[PDB]
Amino acid sequence: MLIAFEGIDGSGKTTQAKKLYEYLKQKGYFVSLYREPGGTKVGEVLREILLTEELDERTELLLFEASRSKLIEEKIIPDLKRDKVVILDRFVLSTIAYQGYGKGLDVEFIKNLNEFATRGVKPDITLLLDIPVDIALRRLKEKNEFENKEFLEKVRKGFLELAKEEENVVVIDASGEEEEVFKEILRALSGVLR
Amino acid sequence: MLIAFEGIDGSGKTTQAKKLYEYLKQKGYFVSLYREPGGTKVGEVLREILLTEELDERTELLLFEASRSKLIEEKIIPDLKRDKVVILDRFVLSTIAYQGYGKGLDVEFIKNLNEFATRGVKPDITLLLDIPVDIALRRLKEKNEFENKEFLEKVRKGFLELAKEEENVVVIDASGEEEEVFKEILRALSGVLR
């Protein structure tokens, strides 16, 4: 089983992916948690490059996809083969929202590149943790992190556009507190999982 | 002006690109020489990863394209804008020959990815240094390097297929000695140097 969390930073998707991981592990599922970019030896080397270097948006996209390619081949496909629940903190929708709607690259091209990196592996469900940018930015300020309002407003709109067209994407109201957000994630997951 | 050398290892394309660089620079052209992968700070970090790590063919392709994206944006496009002669040791045909014909990835997909990485920048001329694999392998043995005959036979065929299809590709007989090969490169270049 594959479960993708998607959303902007400050949307609580790291916290909520961890909550689901612990909850499912308590219920007796064998669980994996991976973050994009990263999650493999080579992927963390690329993560560092993506964080450190000044990178044009095309090179940035290609390196993100390379991290995802490695993760898919090295871990996700074997994990899925032995019936693990695989939880991703970020996956393919975030690439389209950030690189496409945000930095202006072609959305159809990004999807085809996602498909290449994943070898067609799609989530059984995607949870979009939708949140107003102002609220996201407030929660980042509490961690002394600052991101660009104008950029994230485009990205948020991109995410909501993608939710209407893409199948198996449930829009979660991430403006709520942790416990409402998690119960809404549980409800959304009852379709995919008994 | 953009001049691409393409071919398998042991085809003499590194030596001959360097010979052309020196020759054109002596004639008063402003010249650049870049190798793929590599040629930028980030590109050489990726070159090392491509040489060191065991990498699946999809991740490998994406990293090659990332190196090319960086090189194109950071150096080739500015170099071309100020009328430098840019010489490449490997470019887009080598990716298609190695990743497509060699490792079996989709050729149309590789071309679309090449186009994305280069932002449509095409060479004014491509020199295919065509050589029998046995002769290539002999010259690698003299450097204590050993590569796979069965793999390079597919790649060579890929290169010759691409020469018939792609425009501005001149097939050079790289089985010759250095001085014949270089004079044949000079003749092939007389169109672009006029």
Swiss-Prot record, chains A, B:
GO CC annotation: cytoplasm; cytosol
Catalytic activity: dTMP + ATP = dTDP + ADP
EC number(s) per entry: 2.7.4.9
Gene Ontology molecular functions: ATP binding; dTMP kinase activity
GO annotation, biological process: dTDP biosynthetic process; dTTP biosynthetic process; dUDP biosynthetic process
InterPro entries attached to this UniProt entry: P-loop_NTPase, Thymidylate_kin-like_dom, Thymidylate_kin_CS, Thymidylate_kinase
Keywords, alphabetical: ATP-binding, Kinase, Nucleotide biosynthesis, Nucleotide-binding, Transferase
Classification via HAMAP family: Thymidylate_kinase
Entry similarity comment: Belongs to the thymidylate kinase family.
Function: Phosphorylation of dTMP to form dTDP in both de novo and salvage pathways of dTTP synthesis.
Entry protein name: Thymidylate kinase
Organism of provenance: Aquifex aeolicus (strain VF5)
Source organism phylogeny: Bacteria, Pseudomonadati, Aquificota, Aquificia, Aquificales
Gene of this entry: tmk
